[PDB]
Amino acid sequence: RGSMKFSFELAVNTKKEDAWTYYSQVNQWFVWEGDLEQISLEGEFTTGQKGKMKMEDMPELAFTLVEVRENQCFSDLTATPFGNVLFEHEILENPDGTISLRHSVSLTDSDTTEEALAFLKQIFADVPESVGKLKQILET
Amino acid sequence: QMGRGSMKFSFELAVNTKKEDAWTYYSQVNQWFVWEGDLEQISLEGEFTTGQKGKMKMEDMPELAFTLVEVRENQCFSDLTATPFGNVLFEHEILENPDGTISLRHSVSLTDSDTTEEALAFLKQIFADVPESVGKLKQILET
């Protein structure tokens, strides 16, 4: 590969089905996507669906749903200067009864560019907060 | 190994290399200078095996005790250090990729029942130079 990937995992005290609600309902991404301005999806929340997303003070971006698995995970793919960025969201079950939420950002490929890595870091910088917000919302 | 209160940062990098070669930079404590950028001193009370204790000192920081909690050649090794936020666990994983290439994944985690900013910021700090550390291992292994 030319792969590089950042992950953040946070354990939360709730049910995977309840977590799934905030993922599979694009209109509720505002509660956890920091800076989300507008969001839309060209159909059902399923593997292969295309949508449009826009963060504050940024051009709106097309994305495609890569691997929707109900109650478990969904991924989205967006084109960037550095090629396709894959964003992953996983609900993991822990033995102690909690679930964990793991969000990951990766650059499909690139020969370890100094600016590639710096690019991922910036995208990934907001991720821990967003996962934090989910946890506090889910533990209500 | 995660559960209530835990948080964990991971960085993974694909490297065109073999697992045995990567493992030599993990299992030999004296090699950590190649990939630990602020490393000043490093020792281990014996052989690179699960349970072994050791010490290490980083630029501008006091010496620190640490334990090897899990070792598997040539897959992974993990160490535990005590901090003001409980124990921090550092993980180092070698993963064989389906295109022959391997991946190195370094992670750091701790347990904070409160999930405070203090604990978060503290973990984030430790994880901050982990991507470059892994990048050095990449550069070294690919020659």
Residue numbers in the entry:
A (entry chain A): -2 to 137
B (entry chain B): -5 to 137
Question: Can you provide the manuscript's text about this entry?
Answer:
One such case is SMU.440 (GeneID: 1029579), which is composed of 138 residues. SMU.440 is a hypothetical protein without any known functions or protein family classification. The crystal structure reveals a fold similar to known polyketide cyclases even though the amino acid sequences are quite different. SMU.440 also shares a similar binding pocket composed primarily of residues with aromatic and acidic side-chains, which points to a potential binding of a polyketide-like molecule.
The crystal structure of SMU.440 has been determined at 2.4 Å resolution using the SIRAS (single isomorphous replacement with anomalous scattering) method and all residues except the last one could be fitted into the electron density. In addition, five residues from the N-terminal His6-tag were also observed in the structure. SMU.440 is comprised of three α-helices and a seven-stranded antiparallel β-sheet, bending into an unclosed β-barrel. The structure belongs to the SCOP superfamily of Bet v1-like proteins. There are two molecules per asymmetric unit (ASU) and they form a homodimer via a pair of antiparallel β-strands. Prediction of assemblies by the PISA server indicates that this dimer interface is the largest (interface area 946.6 Å2) with a favorable interaction energy (ΔiG −6.9 kcal/mol), in agreement with the dimer state in solution observed during the gel filtration chromatography experiment. A large forked cavity is formed as the β-barrel wraps around the long C-terminal α3-helix. The volume of the cavity is about 1 050 Å3 with a surface area of ∼700 Å2. The cavity is comprised of Trp26, Trp29, Glu30, Asp32, Met50, Met52, Met55, Phe60, Phe71, Asp73, Thr75, Thr77, Val82, Phe84, His86, His100, Val102, Phe116, Ile120, Asp123, Val124 and Ser127, most of which are quite conserved residues among the SMU.440 homologs. In the bottom of the pocket are primarily aromatic residues; whereas at the top of the pocket, close to the cavity opening, the residues can be divided into two parts, one side with mainly acidic and the other with neutral residues.
